[PDB]
Every structure is written in C-alpha cells, then in structure tokens.
Amino acid sequence: NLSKFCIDMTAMAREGKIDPVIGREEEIRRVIRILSRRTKNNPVLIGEPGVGKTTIVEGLAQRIVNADVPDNLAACKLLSLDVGALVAGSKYRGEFEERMKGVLKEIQESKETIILFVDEIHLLMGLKPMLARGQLHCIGATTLAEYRKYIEKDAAFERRFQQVLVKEPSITETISILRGLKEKYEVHHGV
Amino acid sequence: NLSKFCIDMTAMAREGKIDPVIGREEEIRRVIRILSRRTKNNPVLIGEPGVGKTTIVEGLAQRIVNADVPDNLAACKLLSLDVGALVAGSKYRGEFEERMKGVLKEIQESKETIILFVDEIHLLMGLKPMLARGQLHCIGATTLAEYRKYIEKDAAFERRFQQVLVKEPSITETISILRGLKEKYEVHHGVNIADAAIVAAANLAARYLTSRRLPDSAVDLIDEAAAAVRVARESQPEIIDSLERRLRQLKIEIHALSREKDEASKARLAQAKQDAQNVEEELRPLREKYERERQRGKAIQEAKMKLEALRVKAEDASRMGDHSRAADLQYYAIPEQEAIIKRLEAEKAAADSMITDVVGPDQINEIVARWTGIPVTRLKTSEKEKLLHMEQALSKIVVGQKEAVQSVSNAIRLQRSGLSNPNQPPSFLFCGPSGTGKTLLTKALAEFLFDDPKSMIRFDMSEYQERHSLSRMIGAPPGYVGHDAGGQLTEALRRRPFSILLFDEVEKAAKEVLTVLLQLMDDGRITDGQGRVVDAKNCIVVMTSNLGAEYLSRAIDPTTRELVMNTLRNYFLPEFLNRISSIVIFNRLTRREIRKIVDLRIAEIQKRLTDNDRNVTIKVSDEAKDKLGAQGYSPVYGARPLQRLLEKEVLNRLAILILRGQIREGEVACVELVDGKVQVLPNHPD
Amino acid sequence: QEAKMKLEALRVKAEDASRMGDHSRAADLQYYAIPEQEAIIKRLEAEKAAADSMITDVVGPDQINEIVARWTGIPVTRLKTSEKEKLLHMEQALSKIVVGQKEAVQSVSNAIRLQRSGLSNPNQPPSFLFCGPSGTGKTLLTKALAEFLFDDPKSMIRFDMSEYQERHSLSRMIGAPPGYVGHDAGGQLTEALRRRPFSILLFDEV
Ligand SMILES: Nc1ncnc2c1ncn2[C@@H]1O[C@H](COP(=O)(O)OP(=O)(O)O)[C@@H](O)[C@H]1O
Ligand SMILES: Nc1ncnc2c1ncn2[C@@H]1O[C@H](COP(=O)(O)OP(=O)(O)O)[C@@H](O)[C@H]1O
Ligand SMILES: Nc1ncnc2c1ncn2[C@@H]1O[C@H](COP(=O)(O)OP(=O)(O)O)[C@@H](O)[C@H]1O
Ligand SMILES: Nc1ncnc2c1ncn2[C@@H]1O[C@H](COP(=O)(O)OP(=O)(O)O)[C@@H](O)[C@H]1O
C-alpha cells in the first residue's frame, strides 16, 4: 500500500495532532464552497511561503471531523501527498511516474471519498491526474509566481481549479495567531 | 489529429451543451451576412470582456444545426480554437508555430467546410493563416483597445475582416439574459433562483461591480450565490444543529449523574432524562421534515435533468429525421417526465428559517458585500430611501452650499422617478470661488451614489486647451497621433459606464472639446476619433468653473445671479448653457460656515484616533477655533488651506506629545490660543 | 507541564468519545478525569507563583530581541530602544547623515510621527515628493530613512522612472494578463509589495 507518501490529515485531526487554526474563516468557506461545486471543484491556494496555506487545509480537516461541513464532505478522508519525499526521493528514472501512478490508483480503488491535498503543486508540473471524472478531489497550494510560471502554462489542467488568494496577515492578525497558539507551544517545549 | 486544441461548437449544439442565447439577433445576422460575402467574409467581434462575444458565436452554432442559416453554411463545422491552451501551453520554442501549422493544415485537408472561431485573436498577432484562398472562414474576437494596438497594425491581415461592434447590454437587457438563463442555472446547481435576486444581481453588478462588464458581472454574481446555497441546502439548519448538540450533551450528563449517589443528583438526573426527551421531541419532527423535503428537492432536480436530457435526444431525433424515436420522446417519455415534475413540485409547496435552497436578494447582497467590502446594511437600503434624504446625506460633507445640494438632489430625483429625458445624462456646471465645495460635492455625490470615490473620473481641462488636444479626449483615426492610447473620455465611458465625469475648470477647454461635452450633454452619446459612437446614457456630468467669484462677496443673493451668469454667456454659447440640467452657483463661505468645516476635520482626526488604539479626545476652545477659521479662509483659495493649517499648528505637536506621553490615554488634547497662536498643550511635564 | 500534557490527552479522548457517540467514556473524562486533572494544575500553579535572576523558564521580550539579533546581526542594544524614543529625536538621527536640508528632515520626521501616533489615514502610506537639484540629498535622505526605520539599506527598493517612459512599460511595473509580454516576470512593483511589504519604494526622476 502506497501509504508511504501520504498522511491522513482527517485522522490527525481526531488525534489532536493539528495545532489550532485562528481566523481564516472566509478562506475555509471558499474552499468548502469550491469543493461542493460540480463545475470546477478543486481549490488551489495561492500565497507567499508561510502565510498559512497549509493550516487552512488543516482547518478543513478539523471541520470534516466536527461535522461542520456540508453532507457531501462529511465522510471524506483528506490526504496530504508528500510531494517533497516523492520528487526528491527519486531520480530521472521512471520512479517518479511509477510512484505517483501507484498513489493515484490507490485513491482510485478504495471506496472512501478522498480529497487529495498537494502542497507545492507546481513541483508536479515539472504528472497527469486527469481523474476528473469525479474520482478525486484535489486541493493545491503554490505561490503566485510559480502558479504563473508553471501552473498557468497548462490551461486545460488549470481551468479545473479555482484560485483562492491567501493574503499575508496583518501584525494585529499575527498576534491573534500567536496568542491562539500560545498554550500549544507552552506545553510542547515545557516553558 | 490536432483535435487537442479545438472543440466542435456545432457538435456541442446538438448535444445540448450550449446554454441559451438571449437577444443579440442583429449581431448574429451581421455575422451570417459577413460570412456569406465573397469579399471580406471573416467577422471580428469587438467588445469589452464579458459583453457576450463568445455566446454570439454559440448562437450561430445553434443556428447552423437548426437549418436557420443560409445554404452556404448549413453543413459547416464551427470549431473553437483554444488559443489560451496554445500560447500558454508553449514557450519561446518552435512549438507555437508548429502547433498552429498543425491545426491550420488539419483544417486544410478534411472536406467539411469549417469555420474557425478564435477568441482573443490579438494573442495571435504577438501567426499567418493566409489561407484566404477560400480555405478557411474565420471568426475573431477581441477588445477595441487590443484591436487597435495589435490587430489594426497589420492592415493586410485586418482588411479581410469586418468589424462587428458588440456593445454592453443595458440593465434591462441584462435581466432578460438572466431570466432566460434562470432554469439552466437552477438545474445545474440544484437550487432555486428568485426573480428578485436576478433584478438585484443586474442592478447591483452595474452599480458596484464596475470592474467587469454586464452581463458577465451579473452572471458570475448569481452563479456564486447559487454555489453558496448549494452548500447551505446540504447542511443541517441551525436549529437542528443546536438541538442535536444539547441532546448529546444531556446524554453525557445522564451517564455521569447516574453514578453519583446523593439526594440532589437523583432529582436532576430524572430532570435530565426529561430535558433529553423534550429535545428529542422537538428534534425528531424537524429533522424528519428536513430530510423528507431535501430528498424531494433532490428528486425534483434529477427529474428536471432527465427531462432536459430527453429534450436533447428529442431535438436531435427530429433534426435527423428519425420520426420513430422522436415520437417516443415527444409524446410519451417527455410528458411522462413532465407529469412527474408537476406532481413532485405541487406537493413541494404544499408540504411547507429551514432548508435554504433558494437564491434570494439577501444572498446577492451578501455575496456582493464580501467582494465589494461594503457592509451588507448599506446595500439593503432602497434607492428610494437614500434619494428622499439626499440633502441630509450630502450636507454632512458639504457646508454652506444648501442651494447647490438641493439642485443636485432634485436633478437626481427627477431621473430615478422617470421625469427627465432618458437619453440625456444629468449635467451640472458648478460655478463659484475656489475652495467652496465644487469638487467636494462631486466626491460626496460619488460616495453617496456608488459608495466609492473611484466611481468619479477626473478630467482637468487645463490639459485640453488647444485644438490639438481633442484626440487625447476621444482618440484618433489609424496612423495618427494617439490612435492606440485612444481617448481619455471614450475609453472611460466604455469601461466605467456608471461613472461621474468631472471636468475641472471647463472655461479653459478648447471650443472643439466643449463641442464634445455638448454632444455628451445633449444626445447621451459621443463619437470617438474613428467615427465610432460610444454610449453614455448612464453617466453623470459635472463641470466646475470659477468665472463668478468676482461678484460674490461673503454673505445666497439673487441680484448677483445674472452678473455671474452673464459672465458665463460669453465664455459659453447659449446652446451650451441651455443643454445643462442645472447651472449651480457656489457663494463664499461665511465665518460660521468656515468654523463647522474645522469641526468636521477634527471629527475626522478624532475618528482615526478612535480607529487606532488611542483614547485621546480632541477639544478645541472657541477662540482657538476662531483663529483656525480666520487663518484658514482665503478670498483666493477658499477653505483649501485649512487641512494643512491644522496639520502644521495642531497635528504636528499633538503627535509629539502623544508619543512623549504628555497626553495619555483617556485624557483630552486641549487645543488653545496661547499668545495669539494656536497650540495644543501638554497634560503632564516631560 | 506533564499535568498539562495529560489534561490535553484527556481532552482528545473526550472529544473523540463525544464524536463517536460513546457517552459512557465521554462522561468519565468530561465530568471526572478532566476536572480532577484541571484541579491538579490549578493547585500546582497557584503554589508556583506563591513560592517565589533564577530558574529562567519564560520567553520574554529580551529572549525575542536576542534571538533576532543573532539572526539579523543587529546589536541587541538597537532593538531594545522603543520606537517612540527614536521618533522623538528623528531629526537628530537623520541630520547626522543629511546636511543642509533641515526643512526636508523636519517634513519626513513629522509625517512619520503622524502615522505612528495614529493621526494619519491608516489606509494611505506616507508619500513624499523630493524636489531639488541633483546631489543635494534627495536619494541620501531616503537611504538614511531606510537605515533609521529598518536598520538596513536593503529595506528600500529603487525604481528608475527613466525605464518606464512609454505606455508599453506598465506591464513591467505591474505584470500582464496570461499570454502577454511579461506575464511570468510579473511586475516590479507588485512583486516587490508581496515579498517586501515593509519597504521604502523610491521612484527616481518621477
Ligand atoms: N491561521 C493560523 N492559525 C494558527 N497558526 C497558523 C495560522 N496560519 C499560519 N500558522 C502557522 O504558521 C506556520 C506556517 O504556516 P503554513 O500554513 O505552513 O504556511 P504555508 O503552508 O502557506 O507555507 C505554521 O507553523 C502554522 O502553525
Ligand atoms: N445573449 C446572451 N444570452 C445568454 N447568456 C449570455 C448572453 N451574453 C452573455 N451571456 C453570458 O455572459 C457570460 C460571459 O459572456 P461571454 O460571451 O463569454 O463574453 P465574452 O466572450 O464577450 O467575454 C457567459 O456565462 C454567458 O452565459
Ligand atoms: N463647503 C465646504 N464644506 C466642507 N469643506 C469644504 C467646503 N469647501 C471647501 N472645503 C474643503 O476644501 C477642500 C477643497 O475644496 P474643493 O471643493 O475642492 O474646492 P473647489 O470649489 O475649488 O472645487 C476640500 O477638501 C474640503 O476639505
Ligand atoms: N545634503 C547632503 N548631505 C550629505 N551628503 C550629500 C548631501 N547631498 C549630496 N550628498 C552626497 O552626494 C551623493 C549623492 O547625493 P544624492 O542625495 O543621491 O543626490 P540627489 O539629490 O540627486 O538624490 C551622496 O552619496 C552624498 O554622499
């Protein structure tokens, strides 16, 4: 089983392994709204590194397990593909292609409705998850420049995604995040 | 086969994959007429993004399959080239050239008469489909600016096309489009769409979503509202959520109370079982009615989807002469289906907030509010309410021009109530000394009508003083001075129709430029540099002047009225002045009026202090307020020096004292008149 | 700290119990285990402050200012000084670099003080037009402002308007729609604002 390359984010949410998510309510509503479409129902988060793209997906995992989702997403297993361990853990050989087809087909067969999150999705554009029959739901993340230079140059693939701009928080917004994270980092380091 | 880059639009038409086309009959006749020529038989659609250029070609595909075309186009395969996937799906390498030659030569060989549609055709001009032997028929689409800057600069290629101007629809025309599209978007998202939302989307898109053109801006708005209700209808109502959680809570408390042995626990454990039972007694009827009724709204929506699919099969049967299958569907399948929808729907209203599966005006006003950033409360207020208290709203910004505020307010009320010429935009000439409120009133009008200072566009007539400058205003014919930049006015009217056009110091405009304003004021439309007539029914014209400040001393007086208006009669021709809705005169601001302007500005500074963390309150003594108003006014620059004067004398020191801690939180910044000069004093020594 | 860790672990088990409809175990934790734990933390913590530099187990502003200083290479002494102190003697600090432009130094200093004290529009960045002969201090004052506000010359980003003289050059400034001239490089200004928000934008020969 190609669980070597994916982590169950919905599982992590049930086990308290996801630090709290502060704010970002409208962005998570947008992701939910996009996913619930039948049209182009794959969100792509677009923001600078470190603005919180990943923790938005983490919040969605928290909402799936807490029934704070629409019915079409309630029984979803939200998987995070470790593309870093995939392209770097590989060479020019046919293992990049073989590894991704393996995970893409494990998603194929098993009967949980599965949403695949791929951070740094531009690394997959230099490959072809054209399982857009309604087989897989995908959440992508990348920066604006790399979305322009690597994702925007394959329209047919892009048009099935809908941009979600994730702006950088204000200082005021940042301390609310740090305040909300305060207790987790207190207990973790023991200080 | 290079079908990788093209989609068969005529095929899509037979498969019901093209949403309906509403109106636009004369434009489709023009395309048909051009295509049928032997001369220049390639139409190029020219219009702003989202006005419906593509759906015009889509309608032609509908006409080709329905034999509603002339014979020369009946057997045509209308292909749409995905130029976006072509130039972007490629680099500097020779694949752009190789990919296009491949498609251009697949068109070459196969024997269907093929019409190629290329949207955003300017992307192909930076290539050479000179197959104008009569090999390919081409339909192009682009905007006017890009047609001028990229298509008009290769004549030989251009002359084989014939322009088709696709103007932006009216609001009225836009709701007809949305009404015609209503059922398609209902079945697609599986929700219902109220008509008042459609009227709301069209009216609000035009007013507040000025960045995109009708009807796309209204279509995107309804489509986003529908998608927002697609998820609401698949979520439990709020009261089922709240009930279900208190129930689960009481079940926890019941398990816990049943362990403690004491007198008080047992008396409330029995009460907890009852409270649990009460909740379950309220929850089961509701949760049952919700699912009972969400299951039927879903049964209706598929009932609608098989109906539509039957009609596609039926339209194609009757098109291909298969009367056997066409009789199956048209007489038995489809009415059996329609009977299922009639019954499921009739019981739906009969069953009878909960189960939100409807796009209403609230959902439209909320979606816009998120996009526009305007509070939802300001969008729900009826236009009729604002207009009735318009003098109230403007007078909070403009002091001492009551006669002016009344004129602006009356003119606007005359047009929303339908008593003014619908082909003439409201036009104003503000006359009076500098710094009296002429520009400010226009800003207040912009923020009152469109809740956005950007809704006004400023033209300084000091930059249009010579006859040469007219091409800057309206554009120029090809090969001339500023053909590609276009005109400032004409380009503003195409991209921001619902705007306020401010012409500052109109007395200095060249007589040729004034002529354009008179056309704008009289006919509601102007002709650009290339003879093209651009529309302007939905704008507002404000012109400012100061040719009357000579006869206005600080005192409004009626004998002084025609000394300024006779000064106007020689600078402007009588036909110019007659076509202005209202010639409005501003007088000089009195000493008391200048004083409230000072209070207005400290109120704004007070707001930023409150908007930030600081609990510092600014109070101004009477005599200090008097010196500010005496130092502030000028018989030459009016109230203009006031904003900087406060900054220099009060705000500079008030800053320093705040950061020094000499005026702390909760205290008052007292601004006084010490030794005859305005100052604000500390409250604690350093 | 372990009392806090078992508390958190209990809340995970309790959240999952109530999620899976196990009201038996959910009542164990929510009503008995967790408050028995919370009572242990309340007592151990109450005596902690009551017992009463030594035992440094606190992240304070000094620890933040020191960590940054190591990363940024700025002396710790320059990071402890309050923003209010610098701004009050701003004319002093700039005048050590810019000679003979006292009216200019006062204008820059007053505008910055207007915004940290909250009296300027919070939606408008401070904007300046320096006007005067070459080699009088216009660029230098902007460098001194950069090193005074952010203690780094890199905090300013320079745009030479001699390279934006034609209408064609706007796409260089802000970018272009897909398939156009410099869609991928983006704009110089727009890309600068995304990646360096707290910057000084110098437009030379505007
Ligand atoms: N809304 C938020 N609430 C709590 N922590 C956040 C939030 N946004 C970002 N963070 C924190 O910021 C750090 C990086 O954020 P991340 O989501 O990884 O950024 P990105 O994925 O966009 O590079 C993480 O340690 C995360 O805990
Ligand atoms: N006459 C019309 N009838 C129905 N829908 C229309 C019409 N004109 C425009 N639309 C709608 O407006 C949206 C954008 O129109 P489109 O033709 O793509 O604009 P353009 O191609 O000029 O950018 C589409 O979703 C389309 O359904
Ligand atoms: N009647 C007035 N009420 C309030 N403020 C005014 C008035 N007249 C002038 N001002 C102030 O003076 C400034 C410039 O006035 P403006 O209306 O632009 O002058 P003009 O009459 O030359 O257009 C405005 O920003 C405003 O603050
Ligand atoms: N007022 C001044 N004080 C100190 N040095 C100056 C002054 N004006 C010019 N200089 C010197 O001249 C050089 C260039 O001056 P600069 O401010 O860039 O000129 P400009 O006014 O054209 O921007 C600086 O490196 C600086 O050394």
**Cβ separation A155–B231 shorter than 8 A:** no
Which strand (E) or helix (H) includes residue B141? strand B137-142
Beta carbons within 8 Å of A155's beta carbon, 6+ residues apart: B82, B84, B85, B88, B89
**Domain ranges within chain A, ordered by starting residue:** 6-165
Resolution value (Å, 1 decimal): 2.7
Q: Which of B329, B283, B272, B274 is nearest to B306 (CA)?
A: B329
Question: At which residue do the structure tokens 């001699």 appear?
Answer: C162
**Cβ separation B255–C23 shorter than 8 A:** yes
Task: Tell me the residue type at B258.
Answer: S
Q: Which of A127, A115, A141, A123 is nearest to A44 (CA)?
A: A141
Experimental method: X-ray
User: What is the 8-class DSSP label of residue B638?
Assistant: B
List C201's β-bridge partners, or say none.
Answer: C157
Q: How is B276-297 classified by DSSP, letter by letter? A: HHHHHHHHHHHHHHHHHHHHHH
Q: Which CATH class is domain B591-680?
A: mainly alpha
Q: Which of B7, B139, B2, B1 is nearest to B82 (CA)?
A: B7
Question: At which residue do the structure tokens 């005859």 appear?
Answer: B676
**Cβ separation C23–B251 shorter than 8 A:** yes
Distance (Å, rounded) from C-alpha B623 to C-alpha B531?
A: 61
CB contacts < 8 A, A to B, total: 37
Q: Which residues of B225-256 are buried (b: 16+ CB within 10 A; e: fewer)?
A: bbbbbbbbbbbbbeebeebbeebbbbbbbbbb
Task: Tell me the residue type at A30.
Answer: R
Check if the beta carbon of residue B634 is closer than 8 Å to that of residue B640. yes
**Residue B315: count of CB within 10 angstroms of its CB:** 19
Distance (Å, rounded) from C-alpha B426 to C-alpha B673?
A: 46
Distance (Å, rounded) from C-alpha B516 to C-alpha B505?
A: 16
**Residue B571: CA atoms inside 13 Å, Cβ hemisphere, count?**
17
Q: Which CATH class is domain B378-585?
A: alpha beta
For ligand 4, the distance from its centroid to the CA atom of residue C126, given in whole angstroms, is: 22
Distance (Å, rounded) from C-alpha C173 to C-alpha C163?
A: 10
Beta carbons within 8 Å of B318's beta carbon, 6+ residues apart: B326, B330
Token reading at A146 = 């790399």
Q: A15 in contact with C at a CB cutoff of 8 Å?
A: yes
3-state SS class at C201: strand
Check if the beta carbon of residue B404 is closer than 8 Å to that of residue B584. yes
**Cβ separation A16–C15 shorter than 8 A:** yes
CA distance to A169, B564, C174, per residue, from A145 (Å)? 19, 59, 13
Domain B378-585 shares a fold with domain B591-680: no
Check if the beta carbon of residue B5 is closer than 8 Å to that of residue B85. yes
Q: Prior bond to B453 cis, omega within 30?
A: no
Options 3.90.1150.10, 3.40.50.11540, 3.40.250.10, 3.40.50.300; CATH for A6-165 is 3.40.50.300
Token reading at B173 = 């025309």
Ligand 4, residues C98, C103, C136: which to mutate, most atoms within 8 A of Cβ? C136
Angle at A174 between CA A169 and CA A178, to 5 degrees: 145
Looking at the partner chain, which of A15, A145, A168 has a beta carbon nearest the beta carbon of C12?
A15
Q: How is B405-433 classified by DSSP, letter by letter? A: HHHHHHHHHHHHTT-S-TTS--EEEEES-
Q: What are the residue ranges of helices labelled H in chain C?
A: 2-19, 23-28, 34-51, 61-72, 76-80, 83-88, 90-95, 102-116, 138-149, 170-174, 188-195
3-state SS class at A43: strand
CA distance to A34, A41, A129, A137, A138, per residue, from A161 (Å)? 9, 7, 13, 10, 9
Find out if CATH 3.30.70.990 is the number for domain C78-206: no
User: What is the 8-class DSSP label of residue B355?
Assistant: -
Distance (Å, rounded) from C-alpha B398 to C-alpha B597?
A: 9
Q: B255 in contact with C at a CB cutoff of 8 Å?
A: yes
Q: Which residues of B132-171 are buried (b: 16+ CB within 10 A; e: fewer)?
A: eeeebbbbbbbbbbbbbbbbbbeeebbeebbbbebbbbbb
β B76-81/B113-118 pair status: parallel
Check if the beta carbon of residue B543 is closer than 8 Å to that of residue B431. no
Distance (Å, rounded) from C-alpha B482 to C-alpha C166?
A: 13
Looking at the partner chain, which of C27, C32, C88 has a beta carbon nearest the beta carbon of B660?
C88
Calculated CA dihedral for residues B412, B417, B421, B424, nearest 10 degrees: 40
For ligand 1, the distance from its centroid to the CA atom of residue A170, given in whole angstroms, is: 14
User: Exposed (0-12), middle (13-18) or buried (19+): which is B408, by Cβ within 10 Å?
Assistant: buried
Q: Which of B129, B190, B115, B196 is nearest to B160 (CA)?
A: B129
User: What is the 8-class DSSP label of residue B586?
Assistant: P
